[PDB]
Design an enzyme around this catalytic site. Structure first.
Site, mmCIF file in Angstrom:
data_model
loop_
_atom_site.group_PDB
_atom_site.id
_atom_site.type_symbol
_atom_site.label_atom_id
_atom_site.label_comp_id
_atom_site.label_asym_id
_atom_site.label_seq_id
_atom_site.Cartn_x
_atom_site.Cartn_y
_atom_site.Cartn_z
ATOM 1 C CG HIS A 1 -0.317 -0.030 2.525
ATOM 2 N ND1 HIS A 1 0.516 -1.049 2.932
ATOM 3 C CD2 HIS A 1 -0.391 0.832 3.565
ATOM 4 C CE1 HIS A 1 0.937 -0.807 4.158
ATOM 5 N NE2 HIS A 1 0.401 0.328 4.567
ATOM 6 C CD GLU B 1 1.326 -4.463 8.594
ATOM 7 O OE1 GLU B 1 0.297 -4.161 9.233
ATOM 8 O OE2 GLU B 1 1.783 -3.759 7.668
ATOM 9 C CG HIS C 1 0.624 3.736 5.142
ATOM 10 N ND1 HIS C 1 -0.019 2.936 6.061
ATOM 11 C CD2 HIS C 1 -0.134 4.851 5.017
ATOM 12 C CE1 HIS C 1 -1.118 3.540 6.474
ATOM 13 N NE2 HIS C 1 -1.212 4.703 5.854
HETATM 14 ZN ZN LIG Z 1 0.070 0.761 6.799
HETATM 15 ZN ZN LIG Z 2 2.941 0.035 7.631
#
Ligand SMILES: [Zn+2]
Ligand SMILES: [Zn+2]
Ligand SMILES: [Zn+2]
EC number: 3.1.27.-
Lengths: 152, 46, 550, 458
Positions: free
Chosen positions: D67, D202, D69
Site C-alpha cells: 500500500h 504484521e 504508506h
Molecule cells: Zn500501513
Molecule cells: Zn505500515
C-alpha cells in the site's frame, strides 16, 4: 520548492545556508523568489514575530544563542548573530523552538440579471463577489456582481 | 494551429501555417485578410 | 464433452457446456428482436397508434393492427427467451456471463427454472446490466398495457400470417417482461469476479474471465480442467475502444473455441459510421431540425459522446443542447466515471491525474450535455427546439423514443440516427412508417469482423471451433461474399437453436499429485525414459486425487 | 525444496518494510519502504545484502508494493532509479495513484527542510512510476512462466492489498498492513482458504463507542458556537473522519459549515472519489443515490473562510508544522477551542491497523502451516508468537533485520493418470483397494498408466 540565503560571495558559485544547518555549493544559474516581509511566525509561547526581531534559542541542537529574523517560512526562521563567526552569522532555527526577546478572467459572460441583463461582455477583472465586465456593445467596463453573470 | 486568411484579390480561403510567407497559393497575391472571429458578437440595437 | 445450444441468436447466445462433471452455462441472452412484431408502447396515448386499422384473417382483429401494410400485435412486447427445456436448468452449476447485453434473461433462468447454482460476472457487467434491467422494467411498467393477444401464437394461425409475423420462431416460448423483484433476486446470486481471476468450481474445472475489449467489464471466458481447455470468445473488440484490450494470449492452445457475438452487418467501418453520425447530426441541427438517437444508456453512447465532444467545437454547434433522457442516465454516467480500472491504458492514465476518465463528464459541468430521468420532470422546462436527444430503447417499442418519434415524425427537418446494430432498422421504423422524418442508419458495431477473427484464429490455433450456423453461411443480405464467413483448417462446428453438439475432444490423463512418501518408494528403473512400478491407495477429495503409500 | 525469507527492512521493528522471499529459486521483494525517525541514511533498506555492485534486475524477479504508506513504499524511487532496477514493480491501482503524491510530499519535506543529501528527484519518481505494473483485486498475474502473484483486499487504506506469491505447489502469502474490522470508508481484510506454506503478517497490536463520543464532542462544541480544529496526519484517517462527519452532519441536518484545507487532502479526496470499488459496502451500495465522497457539507477551506467568526469545523493539514499552528494560536483561549489530537484538548484515536485478535483470526482463516512476524514491536511479537504457537498449534518465527529464515517444504509431483485406470479405480473400491500401475517417467513429463498400456506403448 526550497529557498535559501547566500552566506559568502564566490567567483563562480554561491555558498548558501538553507534550512538544513548545512552549507551547500551551487552554481549561479539559482532563481529569485519574492520575500514575504509581512509574514507571521509563532514561537513556543505562541507570540507573533516578524522581520528584524531578536529571538532567543531555547530548544534544538543550538539552544542558548540569540538571532535576528531576516526571512520566514511555514515552520522555519532565519537567524543572525554578529558575534557568531561561522558562515557570516547566518543560521536557521525552527519557529516553535524560539522565544521573543481567477478562472473567470478572460471568459465571455452574459449578464443574466439586473439592469444590464442580456449584455455580452468579457471579464477583465474579478473577485469572489464582483467582476469587471468589458461590455461588447458599449465602450464601458462595468462592475457586475458574479451572481448575475452567466458564462457563455 | 490551423489559420485561415482571405486573399485580397481573388477571395480564396487560404490555409497557411506560421513563419511561411504571405503568398496566395493559386494567384500569388501577397495581401491577405483575417476572417471574422468566431466569438460571440452581440450588440444592443441602440 | 457436450455443448447444448439454447439460443439461435449469434450475438445473444445461451450455450450450456457439459464439461467433465460440471455443467457450465455460457451466457444467457434475451432476444429482444421478438419485440419488433409488437406495437410500440407509448408514454401517452397517441391518436395515430390507438386507431390503427385492424387486420383480418378469414378463419383476431382486436389482436392484430396493420400499419402501412405491416401487421403488428397489439399486446405488450414479449421477449424470446433462451430455450429452457432441452436441459434441466437445476442440473447446471455455474452461469458465466460475458456482457451486460448477454446478462438479460438472467431473471428467467435464475427464478422460473429452479436453477440453484451460482453466477459469475465482472463488476461493470453486473452494475450496467442492473441499470439496463432497471430501465427495461421501468419502460415496460410506466404505462402498463395488458397481454391481451394470445390467439396469434397458434400453429394453425401463424402459418396464415404475413411474413414478418409468420417468420417469428418459438413464439409459444415468448414471455412477458420480468419484474423488479425478479431482477433483485437474480442479481443477488451473482458472485463478482475480476479479470484473470482463477475460480475453482468444485475442484474439477477452473474458469477465468479474460478482457474482451467490447464493453467496459465485458469478458471472454476460458474453462480449464487439468490438461484440456475450452475457450469461450463472446463479443470482443480489436479496435481502440475505451475498455481494456482483448486478451488474446490466454486463449492459446485451447482444444475447442466457442465463439459468439461477431459483428452484425460486418460491411461497415465503425469510424466511418461515427463520421457519418456526426456529419448527419451537424447537418440536421444546422437546418433547425431535431436529432433523435435511440441508444442504450451505456456502451456506444460513450464513444459517440466522446466524438461529439470533439466535434461540436469544430462544427460550432455549442448552442445545440444535447439531451440524455433515461431512468438510469445519471447512474450510467457515474458508473462510467468510476469504472476506470476496467478501461484501456489511455483512459486509466487520466485518473492517475485528478481527472475524470471519460470526457463526457466535462459536458455536464460545461452544461453542453444535460441528462434527465424522464421527459416529464424538468426536461419539459429545459427544452430548446433545435436539439439532440439520446433516449429510449433502440428497439423503438418502449421508452421515451416512442414519444419523441410520435412528436417529431411529422416534420422532414427532424432526423433519427441509428447507431445500435441489434435491431432491424426497417422493422424498427415499420410501426411508425408514414413519417416525414429522415432516418439515418449508421451502426457502430465495434465487435470482431471476419478478417479480425480470421487473424485471431490464425494467432490462437484452436484444435476445434464451435460457432453458430449463421457464421458458416454468408449473411442473407449478401449471400455471395465468401469472405463474410468463418473459415478454418478444420471446417468448424455449426449449431442452431435447441441443438446438442458432441465434442470428441475428450482425452485421458487426469492430473494427480503424489506425496514425497510414495516418491521415495518408487525406484526409477532404467528403460531408455524411465519406468517404475507403483502400488498405492488412491485418495480422492473435492475432485482432486492423491496417491498414498499403503 | 526450501523457502528462504530474509527481511532486510522491518524485522522486529516498525517502519521500513522490506522482506525478501526466495521461494522455489525465484526471489521476490515484498515491500520497499523507508524508516521515518532515522536521518542517518538508514531510511532506505540495506540493498547491499542482495547485490554489491551487481544488477538487481537479474536477482529480483518481482517487486511487490502492499500500500501507499511511506514505510512500505517510500524507498521505491531510490531502489529503482538510483540502485538500478528496471523489472516489474507490482502495485495496486489506488496505490499507484496515491504513491506519486505522497512520495512527492516527502520529497518536498526531505529536500526543502530536513536533511536529504542522497535522495530522489521528482523526475526519477516519475521514472519509477513508469515501471509500475498495476494489478486488480484477485487477479492472478503471471510475472514469470511459473511464478504468479495475486492481490487480496486488505482494508488498511484505500487499495491496501494482501499478496499471495504462488510458484508451483508452494505459496507464500504476505499481508503488508490490514484491518479485520471494517471502517466507515473501507471494508475488512479477506482471504480465502489458501493454506499457504508461510504467512508473513504484521504484528504490532469500542470503535463505535469512540466514534459516538467523538461525534458527541464535536456536536457539543459546535452547538455552543465555537469552532473545532481537529488535525489529520494520515490520508486514511482524514477520509474516515470526513465521511463519518459528513454522514453525521447530514443526519442531524444542521447547516453550520465544515472545511478541509491543503492542496494534498483535495487530491486525496479526488482519488478516493475515483476509486469507489475499493471502498466499504455502504459507499458502493448507495453510490447510485449519490457519491459519498462528493461532500455536500465539507467544502474547500480558503484559509478556513478567512478564519471567519462563528461555529465551523476545520481540518488541519498536518497532525508540529505549518497550516495548523496558525489556527492553534489564533483559537487558543476561545469559547470552544476543541483541538482533538490522534485551549481544550481532546483525545480521540482511531486504529488503522489490526489488533491481536484480528491477526489471530487471519491466521485461523487463511490456515497456513507456518507464520512469520514483521512490522511491529518485539515484545508484542513475542506475546503474539506465544499466542500463535499455543492456540492454533502452528510454527511462528522471529526474524530481525538481515536475519534469514529458511523453511523446508515438501513438493508434490504432478503426474498424469490414464483415464481408464482412473475410472477402474473409481469402479472398484467405492463399494482401501490398492492401485497398481506403471509410472512412465519420461523426459519433462510423468505418466502413470496400467501395465497393459505400458507394454503396448513400451
Ligand atoms: Zn500501513
Ligand atoms: Zn505500515
Ligand atoms: Zn489570391
Amino acid at each position: 520548492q526550497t529557498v535559501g540565503v547566500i552566506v559568502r560571495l564566490e567567483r563562480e558559485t554561491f555558498q548558501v545556508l538553507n534550512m538544513y544547518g548545512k552549507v551547500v555549493t551551487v552554481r549561479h544559474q539559482v532563481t529569485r523568489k519574492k520575500d514575504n516581509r509581512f509574514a507571521v511566525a509563532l514561537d513556543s509561547e505562541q507570540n507573533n514575530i516578524h522581520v528584524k526581531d531578536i529571538v532567543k534559542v531555547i530548544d534544538g541542537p543550538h539552544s542558548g544563542r540569540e538571532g535576528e529574523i531576516r526571512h520566514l517560512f511555514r515552520s522555519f526562521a532565519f537567524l543572525h548573530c554578529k558575534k557568531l563567526v561561522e558562515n557570516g552569522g547566518m543560521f536557521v532555527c525552527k519557529t516553535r523552538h524560539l522565544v521573543l526577546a481567477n478562472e473567470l478572467i478572460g471568459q465571455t459572460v452574459r449578464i443574466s440579471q439586473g439592469p444590464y441583463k442580456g449584455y455580452i461582455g468579457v471579464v477583465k477583472d474579478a473577485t469572489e463577489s464582483t467582476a469587471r465586465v468589458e461590455l461588447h456593445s458599449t465602450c464601458q467596463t462595468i462592475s457586475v456582481d458574479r451572481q448575475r453573470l452567466t458564462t457563455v | 494551429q490551423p489559420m485561415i486568411y482571405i486573399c485580397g484579390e481573388c477571395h480564396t480561403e487560404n490555409e497557411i501555417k506560421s513563419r511561411d510567407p504571405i503568398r496566395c497559393r493559386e494567384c500569388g497575391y501577397r495581401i491577405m485578410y483575417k476572417k471574422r472571429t468566431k466569438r460571440l458578437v452581440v450588440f444592443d440595437a441602440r | 464433452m457436450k455443448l447444448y445450444c439454447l439460443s439461435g441468436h449469434p450475438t445473444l447466445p445461451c450455450n450450456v457446456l457439459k464439461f467433465k462433471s460440471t455443467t457450465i452455462m455460457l451466457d444467457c441472452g434475451l432476444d429482444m428482436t421478438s419485440t419488433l412484431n409488437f406495437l410500440p408502447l407509448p408514454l401517452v396515448q397517441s391518436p395515430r397508434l390507438s386507431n390503427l386499422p385492424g387486420w383480418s384473417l378469414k378463419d383476431l382483429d382486436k389482436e392484430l393492427k396493420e400499419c402501412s401494410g405491416h401487421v403488428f400485435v397489439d399486446s405488450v412486447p414479449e421477449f424470446c427467451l433462451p430455450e429452457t427445456e432441452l436441459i434441466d436448468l437445476s442440473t447446471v452449476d455455474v452461469i458465466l456471463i460475458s456482457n451486460y447485453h448477454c446478462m438479460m434473461a438472467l431473471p428467467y433462468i435464475t427464478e422460473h427454472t429452479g436453477f440453484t447454482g451460482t453466477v459469475y460476472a465482472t463488476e461493470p457487467t453486473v452494475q450496467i446490466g442492473r441499470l439496463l434491467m432497471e430501465e427495461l422494467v421501468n419502460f415496460i411498467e410506466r404505462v402498463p398495457k395488458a397481454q391481451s393477444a394470445s390467439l396469434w401464437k397458434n400453429k394453425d394461425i401463424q402459418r396464415l400470417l404475413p411474413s414478418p409475423l409468420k417468420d417469428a420462431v418459438e413464439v409459444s416460448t415468448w414471455r412477458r417482461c420480468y419484474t423488479m423483484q425478479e431482477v433483485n433476486s437474480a442479481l443477488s446470486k451473482i458472485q463478482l469476479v475480476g479479470y484473470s481471476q482463477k475460480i475453482e468450481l468444485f475442484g474439477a474445472v477452473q474458469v477465468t474471465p479474460l478482457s474482451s475489449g467490447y464493453a467496459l467489464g465485458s469478458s471472454n471466458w476460458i474453462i480449464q480442467s487439468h490438461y484440456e481447455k475450452v475457450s469461450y470468445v463472446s463479443g470482443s473488440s480489436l479496435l481502440t475502444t475505451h475498455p481494456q484490450p482483448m486478451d488474446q494470449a490466454s486463449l492459446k492452445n485451447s482444444d475447442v473455441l466457442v465463439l459468439t457475438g461477431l459483428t452484425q452487418i460486418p460491411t461497415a467501418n465503425p469510424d466511418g459510421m461515427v463520421g457519418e453520425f456526426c456529419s448527419n447530426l451537424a447537418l440536421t441541427v444546422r437546418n433547425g431540425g431535431n436529432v433523435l438517437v435511440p441508444c442504450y444508456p451505456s456502451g456506444v453512447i460513450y464513444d459517440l459522446l466522446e466524438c461529439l465532444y470533439q466535434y461540436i467545437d469544430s462544427a460550432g454547434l455549442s448552442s445545440v443542447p444535447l439531451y440524455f433522457i433515461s431512468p438510469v442516465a445519471n447512474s450510467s454516467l457515474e458508473f462510467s466515471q468510476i469504472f476506470a480500472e476496467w478501461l484501456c491504458h489511455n483512459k486509466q492514465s487520466k485518473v492517475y491525474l485528478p481527472e475524470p476518465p471519460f470526457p463526457h463528464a466535462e459536458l455536464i459541468q460545461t452544461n453542453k450535455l444535460k441528462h434527465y430521468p424522464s421527459i416529464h420532470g424538468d426536461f419539459s422546462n429545459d427544452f430548446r427546439q433545435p436539439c439532440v436527444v439520446f433516449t429510449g430503447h433502440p428497439s423503438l417499442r418502449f421508452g421515451d423514443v416512442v414519444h419523441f418519434m410520435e412528436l417529431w415524425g411529422k416534420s422532414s427537418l427532424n432526423t433519427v440516427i441509428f447507431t445500435e446494430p441489434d435491431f432491424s432498422y426497417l422493422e424498427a421504423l415499420a410501426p411508425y412508417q408514414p413519417l416525414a422524418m429522415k432516418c439515418i442508419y449508421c451502426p457502430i458495431d465495434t465487435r470482431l469482423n471476419f478478417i479480425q477473427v480470421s487473424k485471431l484464429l490464425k494467432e490462437v490455433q484452436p484444435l476445434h471451433v464451435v460457432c453458430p450456423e449463421q457464421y458458416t453461411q454468408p449473411p442473407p443480405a449478401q449471400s455471395h461474399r465468401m469472405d463474410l464467413m468463418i473459415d478454418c483448417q478444420p471446417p468448424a462446428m455449426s449449431y442452431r437453436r435447441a441443438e446438442v453438439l458432441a465434442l470428441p475432444f475428450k482425452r485421458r490423463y487426469e492430473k494427480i499429485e503424489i506425496m514425497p512418501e510414495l516418491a521415495d518408494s518408487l525406484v526409477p528403473m532404467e528403460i531408455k525414459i524411465s519406468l517404475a512400478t507403483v502400488s498405492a491407495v488412491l485418495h480422492t477429495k473435492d475432485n482432486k486425487h492423491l496417491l498414498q503409500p499403503p | 525444496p526450501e523457502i528462504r525469507v530474509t527481511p532486510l527492512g522491518a524485522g522486529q521493528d516498525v517502519g521500513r518494510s522490506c522482506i525478501l522471499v526466495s521461494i522455489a529459486g525465484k526471489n521476490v521483494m515484498l515491500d520497499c519502504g523507508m524508516h521515518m525517525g532515522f536521518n542517518d541514511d538508514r531510511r532506505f533498506p540495506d540493498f547491499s545484502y542482495i547485490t554489491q555492485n551487481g544488477r538487481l534486475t537479474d536477482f529480483l524477479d518481482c517487486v511487490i508494493i502492499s500500500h501507499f504508506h511511506l514505510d512500505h513504499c517510500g524507498a521505491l524511487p531510490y531502489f529503482s532509479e538510483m540502485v538500478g532496477y528496471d523489472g516489474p514493480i507490482y502495485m495496486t491501482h489506488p496505490t499507484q495513484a496515491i504513491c506519486p503524491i505522497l512520495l512527492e510530499d516527502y520529497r518536498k519535506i526531505a529536500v526543502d527542510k530536513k536533511g536529504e543529501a542522497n535522495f530522489f528527484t521528482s523526475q526519477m519518481i516519475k521514472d519509477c512510476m513508469k515501471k509500475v505494473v498495476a494489478v486488480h483485486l484477485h487477479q492472478t498475474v503471471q510475472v514469470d512462466d511459473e511464478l504468479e502473484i495475486k492481490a487480496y483486499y486488505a482494508g488498511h487504506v484505500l487499495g491496501a492489498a494482501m499478496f499471495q506469491i504462488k510458484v508451483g505447489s508452494e505459496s507464500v502469502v504476505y499481508t503488508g498492513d490490514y484491518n479485520m474490522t471494517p471502517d466507515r470508508h473501507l471494508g475488512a481484510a479477506w482471504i480465502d482458504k489458501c493454506r499457504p506454506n508461510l504467512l508473513i503478517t504484521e504484528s504490532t497490536y469500542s470503535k463505535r463507542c469512540r466514534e459516538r463520543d467523538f461525534l458527541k464532542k464535536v456536536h457539543e462544541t459546535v452547538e455552543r458556537g465555537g469552532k473545532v480544529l481537529i488535525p489529520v496526519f494520515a490520508l486514511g484517517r482524514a477520509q474516515e473522519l470526513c465521511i463519518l462527519l459528513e454522514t453525521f452532519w447530514e443526519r442531524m441536518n444542521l447547516k453550520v459549515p465544515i472545511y478541509f484545507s491543503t492542496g494534498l487532502t483535495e487530491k486525496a479526496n479526488h482519488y478516493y472519489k475515483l476509486f469507489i470499488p475499493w471502498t466499504n459496502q455502504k459507499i458502493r451500495k448507495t453510490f447510485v443515490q449519490r457519491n459519498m465522497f462528493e461532500f455536500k457539507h465539507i467544502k474547500a477551506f480558503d484559509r478556513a473562510f478567512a478564519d471567519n467568526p462563528g461555529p465551523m469545523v476545520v481540518f488541519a493539514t498536518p497532525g508540529h508544522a505549518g497550516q495548523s499552528l496558525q489556527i492553534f494560536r489564533k483559537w487558543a483561549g476561545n469559547e470552544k477551542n476543541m483541538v482533538i489530537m490522534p485551549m481544550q484538548v481532546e483525545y480521540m484515536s482511531f486504529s488503522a491497523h489490526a489488533d491481536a485478535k484480528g491477526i489471530m483470526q487471519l491466521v485461523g482463516q487463511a490456515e497456513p502451516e507456518s507464520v512469520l512476524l514483521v512490522h511491529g514491536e518485539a515484545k508484542k511479537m513475542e506475546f503474539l508468537k506465544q499466542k500463535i504457537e499455543q492456540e492454533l498449534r502452528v510454527n511462528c518465527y522471529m526474524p530481525a533485520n538481515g536475519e534469514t529464515v529458511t523453511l523446508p517444504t515438501s513438493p508434490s509431483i504432478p503426474v498424469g493418470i490414464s483415464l481408464g485406470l482412473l475410472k477402474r479405480e473409481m469402479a472398484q473400491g467405492l463399494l482401501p483397494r490398492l492401485l497398481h500401475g506403471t509410472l512412465i517417467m519420461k523426459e519433462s513429463n510423468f505418466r502413470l498408466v496400467s501395465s497393459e498400456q505400458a507394454l503396448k506403448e513400451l
